[PDB]
Amino acid sequence: AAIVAGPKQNCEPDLMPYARPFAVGKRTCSGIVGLPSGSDPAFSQPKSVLDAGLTCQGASPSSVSKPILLVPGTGTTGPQSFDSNWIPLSAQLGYTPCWISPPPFMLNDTQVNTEYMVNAITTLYAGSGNNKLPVLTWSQGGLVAQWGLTFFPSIRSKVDRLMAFAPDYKGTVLASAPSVWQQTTGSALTTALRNAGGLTQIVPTTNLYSATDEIVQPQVSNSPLDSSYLFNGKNVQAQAVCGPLFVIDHAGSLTSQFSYVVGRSALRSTTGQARSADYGITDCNPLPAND
Amino acid sequence: AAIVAGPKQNCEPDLMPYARPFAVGKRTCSGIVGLPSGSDPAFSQPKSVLDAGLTCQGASPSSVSKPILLVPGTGTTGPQSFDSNWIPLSAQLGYTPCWISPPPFMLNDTQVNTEYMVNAITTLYAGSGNNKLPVLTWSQGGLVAQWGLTFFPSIRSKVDRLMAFAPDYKGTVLASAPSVWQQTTGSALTTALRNAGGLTQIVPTTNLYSATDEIVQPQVSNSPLDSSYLFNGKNVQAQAVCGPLFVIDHAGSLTSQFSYVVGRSALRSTTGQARSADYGITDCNPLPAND
Ligand SMILES: CC(=O)N[C@@H]1[C@@H](O)[C@H](O)[C@@H](CO)O[C@@H]1O
Ligand SMILES: CC(=O)N[C@@H]1[C@@H](O)[C@H](O)[C@@H](CO)O[C@@H]1O
Ligand SMILES: CC(=O)N[C@@H]1[C@@H](O)[C@H](O)[C@@H](CO)O[C@H]1O
Ligand SMILES: CC(=O)N[C@@H]1[C@@H](O)[C@H](O)[C@@H](CO)O[C@H]1O
Ligand SMILES: *[PH](O)(CCCCCC)OC
Ligand SMILES: *[PH](O)(CCCCCC)OC
């Protein structure tokens, strides 16, 4: 009942177990609050159904050398998204291209689409001799990758890096199919990802995007406000490097020569993220890389 | 492997159980996602210790008529915060004033301070014949009330309304004691409250605050950006009603005549929130109400 201004610390008190899951990324006395690490949520789909959506080029996912998992965009299959680009480009870099094609064309529940990716990572990790593998994505594919890493603890140590092209982590304001509702800015899904701490990278991540993206917006600030931005990630907005006259659209973000140089840098980097020293003004080419 | 633009719904798919707690307040096919309703988190303090912090004027908390629970601000006890104002003002309105004085002067862990309030509500609810009671707060007291309502399901049906004066739900940028760290904008605690859905009212709530608050900021926009704002709540920024020349500081937000008229309105309202029809320009008096 007397003087008490005393209580003085040099750190914020740790959050109680019941609130800890809601402050991932923040620092308290014990350190940075990490993501919950319990058991994986159960799949709503039979494993045999999830396996039907996974394919590797020239090999079985159960026995594959240096696999790379490609996750497609909304309204497409793995081949439709990557046949003209990262399937042959990654093969040229020494990887065995693998991809998932969640039915129907990624239009269904993003949470279900994520099951295909989680199962695929589990499969390819073991299939490659229990070795981490890179994941490369386009559009919703990135949202799926981060959703998986946020809610399925088992794959966090199985993914070595994430190279996401035009990812819509905050959804888009330019937005119906189930996944379209979920990718609309302000959706319950994008809100959940943010509130669970999903806007901070979980594995070494590189996000390549464009201010002139005609599908995903806002992307114009080259800051945390952009939909493709992840805290601690290597966030590369094309125009920040190439200037305001460099125009690549949503698909160009995945297929341009600039995108290839950045992606290649991320894939070979020992840090798991693309390095500024690997690209410059001369790589600011909007033409297709596989061309 | 053919046409599929088909999948078309009129609502966003429901979130899976594992993600539902992170999207409270959002609407999916089944409706608005509500707060989790499991068992109450366990107390870190012995109940006898929590009981020592609860007092009612002229009665025992275990047998009291029409109680009102007053929750004090940082660096004060219940009497220091309310002796000159809401203790006698509420008694005049027909209530039995009760309050908690979490030691030491609300400077300790806000999560612990909340235990005192949860225990107090449980006690007063039963003590008044299993009847809901109003909670009136000042500064951190409001943060404590909302933290309790967000994480302790049992009291949601025991609190009839919340009248918060200058509540710092987003903390303050003008910010050490444990609770001071926690009330600093960007803290793990304020982040957790927001991420768990605590910035939307849980019970009928009225938030009275001032743009000229010298302790809690920002409060100048009369919008969701203000620290005292709660979605669906009756948010009353003094200057929006009284104009830019109306100046009441942090304590004035609790004790002014304007504050009394709004508080009285909230306490007697059948909606549980203050009503615009009960106050106007003539009530824009900065002088103390108990005067
Ligand atoms: C896997 C697939 O393409 N078909 C499903 C269908 O079975 C399900 O009823 C519907 C809503 O859940 O979502 C998709 O249309
Ligand atoms: C109840 C009280 O006023 N004293 C506690 C003290 O026992 C505790 O060690 C410290 C840190 O938890 O917080 C306060 O100072
Ligand atoms: C919402 C906001 O403030 N973001 C702005 C954006 O609107 C603007 O186009 C951009 C210019 O590059 O600068 C950002 O700070
Ligand atoms: C951060 C922000 O944009 N909030 C501004 C605030 O700075 C300004 O003082 C107020 C004027 O009342 O208008 C709000 O919209
Ligand atoms: P991406 O998956 C982002 C799609 C958002 C749907 C709303 C238009 O594109 C291939
Ligand atoms: P309130 O509890 C808000 C206090 C914030 C502490 C940082 C200065 O005031 C009585």
DSSP collapsed to 3 states, chain A: CCCCCCCCCCCCCCCCCCCHHHCCCCEECCEECCCCCCCCCCCCCCHHHHHCCEEECCEECCECCCEEEEECCCCCCHHHHHCCCHHHHHHHCCCEEEEECCCCCCCCCHHHHHHHHHHHHHHHHHHCCCCCEEEEEECHHHHHHHHHHHHCHHHCCCEEEEEEECCCCCCECCCCCHHHHHCECCCHHHHHHHHCCCCECCCCEEEEECCCCCCCCCCCCCCCCCCCCCECCEEEEHHHHHCCCCCCCCCHHHHEHHHHHHHHHHHHCCCCCCCHHHCCHHHCCCCECCC
Residue nearest to atom 8 of ligand 3 (CA): A221
Structural tokens at position B130: 């299993």
Chain centre to alpha carbon of residue B32: 22
One of B90, B227, B250, B256 is an active-site residue; which one? B250
Residue B15 and residue A178: Cβ atoms within 8 Å? Answer: no
Tell me if A147 sits within 8 A of A179, measured CB to CB: no
Closest-lying ligand 2 atom to the alpha carbon of residue B104: 3
Structural tokens at position B153: 């399901």
- Among B103, B153, B84, B181, smallest CA distance to A23 is for B181
Termini Cα distance of chain B: 78
Owner of token pair 């007397």: A2
Tell me if A74 sits within 8 A of A107, measured CB to CB: yes
For ligand 4, pick from B212, B220, B239 the residue to mutate: most ligand atoms within 8 Å of CB.
B220
- Among B256, B258, B246, smallest CA distance to B283 is for B258
Termini Cα distance of chain A: 78
Structural tokens at position A258: 């600039």
Owner of token pair 């003590």: B127
Structural tokens at position A252: 């160009």
One of B81, B101, B139, B187 is an active-site residue; which one? B139
Owner of token pair 């220091």: B80
What are the beta bridge partners of residue A70? A99, A136
Tell me if A182 sits within 8 A of A144, measured CB to CB: no
Structural tokens at position A286: 């909007």
Mapping DSSP onto H, E and C, the string for chain B reads CCCCCCCCCCCCCCCCCCCHHHCCCCEECCEECCCCCCCCCCCCCCHHHHHCCEEECCEECCECCCEEEEECCCCCCHHHHHCCCHHHHHHHCCCEEEEECCCCCCCCCHHHHHHHHHHHHHHHHHHCCCCCEEEEEECHHHHHHHHHHHHCHHHCCCEEEEEEECCCCCCECCCCCHHHHHCECCCHHHHHHHHCCCCECCCCEEEEECCCCCCCCCCCCCCCCCCCCCECCEEEEHHHHHCCCCCCCCCHHHHEHHHHHHHHHHHHCCCCCCCHHHCCHHHCCCCECCC
Residue nearest to atom 8 of ligand 6 (CA): B175
Owner of token pair 């609130």: A19
- Among A140, A237, A236, smallest CA distance to A189 is for A140
Mutate to test the interface with B, among A3, A143, A191 (most CBs of B within 10 A): A191
Name every chain B residue with its beta carbon within 8 A of the beta carbon of A6: 104, 107
Please state whether beta strands B96-100 and B54-56 pair in parallel, antiparallel, or not at all (unpaired): antiparallel
Tell me if A102 sits within 8 A of A116, measured CB to CB: yes
- Among B104, B90, B84, B107, smallest CA distance to B56 is for B90
Residue A21 and residue B21: Cβ atoms within 8 Å? Answer: yes
Owner of token pair 């070494």: A204
Report residue A114: phi and psi, to 5°.
-65, -30
CA distances from A210 to A217, A234, A286, B10 (A): 9, 14, 11, 31
C-alpha A161/C-alpha A121 separation (Å) is 12
Structural tokens at position B44: 């870190």
B128 tagged catalytic: no
Query: What number does CATH give the domain B1-291?
Result: 3.40.50.1820
Residue A1 and residue B188: Cβ atoms within 8 Å? Answer: no
What are the beta bridge partners of residue B55? B99
Chain centre to alpha carbon of residue B44: 22
Owner of token pair 């999948």: B7
Residue B22 and residue A196: Cβ atoms within 8 Å? Answer: yes
B179 tagged catalytic: no
Owner of token pair 């009284």: B242
- State in Å: Cα A220 to ligand 3 middle: 6
Name every chain B residue with its beta carbon within 8 A of the beta carbon of A176: 8-9
- Among A235, A109, A229, smallest CA distance to A170 is for A229
Structural tokens at position A242: 């190439």
Owner of token pair 């859905």: B197
- Among A199, A197, A175, A196, smallest CA distance to A187 is for A175
Structural tokens at position A245: 């006259």
C-alpha A148/C-alpha B46 separation (Å) is 40
CA distances from A249 to A207, A216, B38, B290 (A): 15, 10, 47, 65
Structural tokens at position A57: 């080029």
CA distances from B236 to A25, A162, B91 (A): 33, 46, 24
C-alpha B257/C-alpha B246 separation (Å) is 12
Tell me if B137 sits within 8 A of B165, measured CB to CB: yes
Tell me if B239 sits within 8 A of B246, measured CB to CB: yes
C-alpha B190/C-alpha B173 separation (Å) is 12
Tell me if A141 sits within 8 A of A26, measured CB to CB: no
ω before B17 within 30° of 0 (cis)? no
Tell me if A260 sits within 8 A of A93, measured CB to CB: no
Structural tokens at position B33: 């996602």
C-alpha B50/C-alpha B200 separation (Å) is 27
Which approach determined this entry?
Answer: X-ray
Structural tokens at position B48: 């006898």
A280: number of Cβ within 10 Å: 11
Cβ–ligand 3 distance for A225 under 6 Å, the answer yes
Strand order in the sheet with B54-56: B54-56, B96-100, B67-71, B133-138, B159-165, B205-209, B234-237
Owner of token pair 């920024």: B237
CA distances from A182 to A109, A142, A177, B96, B254 (A): 8, 14, 9, 49, 42
- State in Å: Cα A166 to ligand 5 middle: 10
For ligand 5, pick from A109, A182, A183 the residue to mutate: most ligand atoms within 8 Å of CB.
A183
Cβ–ligand 5 distance for A177 under 6 Å, the answer no
Q: Under 8 Å CB-to-CB from A105, ≥6 apart: which residues?
A: A74, A75, A76, A77, A80, B4, B5
* Catalytic site positions of A: 139, 213, 250
C-alpha B121/C-alpha B108 separation (Å) is 20
C-alpha A86/C-alpha A70 separation (Å) is 8
Residues belonging to chain B = 291
**For chain A, which residues make up each domain, given as ranges?**
1-291
Residue nearest to atom 6 of ligand 6 (CA): B180
Residue from the list B8, B188, B195 with its beta carbon closest to the beta carbon of A195: B195
Q: Which ligand is nearest to the CA of A80?
A: 5
